[PDB]
Write an enzyme that holds these catalytic residues in place. Structure first.
Site, short mmCIF file in Angstrom:
data_model
loop_
_atom_site.label_atom_id
_atom_site.label_comp_id
_atom_site.label_asym_id
_atom_site.label_seq_id
_atom_site.Cartn_x
_atom_site.Cartn_y
_atom_site.Cartn_z
N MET A 34 3.16 -2.57 25.00
CA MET A 34 4.55 -2.13 25.07
C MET A 34 4.67 -0.67 24.67
SD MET A 34 6.59 -5.44 23.59
CE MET A 34 7.93 -4.61 22.74
N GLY A 35 3.85 -0.23 23.70
CA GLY A 35 3.94 1.13 23.12
C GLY A 35 3.04 1.41 21.90
N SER A 36 2.90 2.70 21.55
CA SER A 36 1.98 3.14 20.49
C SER A 36 2.17 4.59 20.00
CB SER A 36 0.52 2.94 20.95
OG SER A 36 -0.42 3.22 19.92
N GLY A 37 1.86 4.83 18.72
CA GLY A 37 1.68 6.18 18.19
C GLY A 37 2.65 6.61 17.12
N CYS A 76 5.03 3.68 14.98
CA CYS A 76 4.72 2.42 14.32
C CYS A 76 4.08 1.52 15.39
CB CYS A 76 5.97 1.73 13.75
SG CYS A 76 6.25 1.84 11.96
N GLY A 77 3.30 2.11 16.30
CA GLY A 77 2.57 1.35 17.33
C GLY A 77 1.41 0.72 16.57
N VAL A 97 1.79 -1.76 19.94
CA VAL A 97 2.63 -2.94 20.15
C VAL A 97 2.27 -3.62 21.47
CG1 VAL A 97 4.98 -3.91 20.23
CG2 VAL A 97 4.48 -1.86 18.85
N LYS A 148 2.71 -6.14 16.60
CA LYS A 148 2.36 -4.77 16.26
C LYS A 148 0.99 -4.82 15.57
CE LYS A 148 5.26 -2.01 14.23
NZ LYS A 148 6.19 -1.89 13.07
N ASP A 194 17.27 7.14 8.51
CA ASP A 194 17.02 7.55 9.89
C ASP A 194 17.86 6.75 10.95
OD1 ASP A 194 15.88 9.48 11.67
OD2 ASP A 194 14.14 8.20 12.02
#
Length: 288
Positions: free
Chosen positions: A23-26, A28-29, A31, A46, A140
């Site tokens: 799904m995604g990374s880099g 809090c990847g 995933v 994750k 944040d």
């Protein structure tokens, strides 16, 4: 491994999860979207590698630590459990549809006030919860940390949940009355909510064409707070809610316990808004 999902607790190993793709990374990847083979639930997993970046891992664990403690808060994405191997930790999380940031991109315009009403109720209750129950100040609050799903749920994201982006910084965070002590309070996060609401309600980030972060900080301090425009038919409740959040003098800025009695929140607490169908349609008709 241990998963608590669908109302049961399962003994489980990483092999019980079917990988459906990255799904995604880099940040809090990294995933993965995965299916739990014993039930058919689909979840986001994750992965925190033991050989991975130490600053990245620290953030993952501090966020995980809050998420684990917030099982009783329906407005915060949930952790179903963890698998620790010799080299990795896999963290099973509630899978959401997308972030409010992406949703604004997909729509290339405003999000409807009624969806933002429901969003505000959920996100203020998450933030209030974090402060009262765990003493956590989020620091944040921005649209990419607000998650929505096909179930109609609206939740504050796990990412950076333990407590960010210069663009959403409150005037007292830029220009501290006195750096120590202590620093600032939840009121800073109230301002960021206000900014997020204006961005989402209008379809545009309210400080225009800033080329750098420092330029946005300068406009935050030099300019009038960027309120809802008067030519868009926003309700009076919503405008007053934004104007309260965007109170530049932080001492005059209401805290959550007060925001929760605001007419905009009270009305949206009970208004029937079909967020799930709206979200399915937007996700259908989109992308951009």
């Amino acid at each position: 491994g241990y998963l608590t999902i669908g109302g049961q607790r399962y003994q489980a190993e990483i092999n019980d999860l079917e990988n459906l793709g990255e799904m995604g990374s880099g940040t809090c990847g990294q995933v993965w979207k995965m299916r739990f083979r014993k039930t058919g639930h689909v979840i986001a997993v994750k992965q925190m590698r033991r050989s991975g970046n130490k600053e990245e891992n620290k953030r993952i664990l501090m966020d995980l630590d809050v998420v684990l403690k917030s099982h009783d808060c329906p407005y915060i994405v949930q952790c179903f459990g963890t698998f620790i191997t010799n080299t990795d930790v896999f963290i099973a999380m509630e899978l959401m549809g997308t972030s409010a940031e992406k949703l604004k991109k997909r729509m290339q315009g405003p999000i409807p006030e009624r969806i933002l009403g429901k969003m505000t109720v959920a996100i203020v209750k998450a933030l209030y919860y974090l402060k009262e129950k765990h003493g956590v100040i989020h620091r944040d609050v921005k649209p990419s940390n607000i998650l929505l799903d096909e179930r109609g749920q609206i939740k504050l994201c796990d990412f950076g949940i333990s407590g960010g982006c210069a663009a959403y910084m409150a005037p007292e965070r830029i220009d501290p009355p006195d750096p120590t002590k202590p620093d600032y309070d939840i009121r800073a996060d109230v301002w960021s909510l206000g900014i997020s609401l204006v961005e989402l309600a209008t379809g545009q980030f309210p400080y225009k064409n800033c080329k750098t972060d420092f330029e946005v900080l300068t406009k935050v301090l030099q300019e009038e707070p960027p309120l809802l425009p008067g030519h868009m038919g926003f309700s009076g409740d919503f405008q007053s809610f934004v104007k309260d959040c965007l109170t530049k003098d932080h001492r005059k800025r209401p805290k959550y316990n007060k925001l929760l009695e605001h007419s905009f929140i009270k009305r949206y607490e009970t208004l029937e808004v079909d967020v799930a169908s709206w979200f399915k349609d937007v996700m259908a008709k989109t992308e951009s």
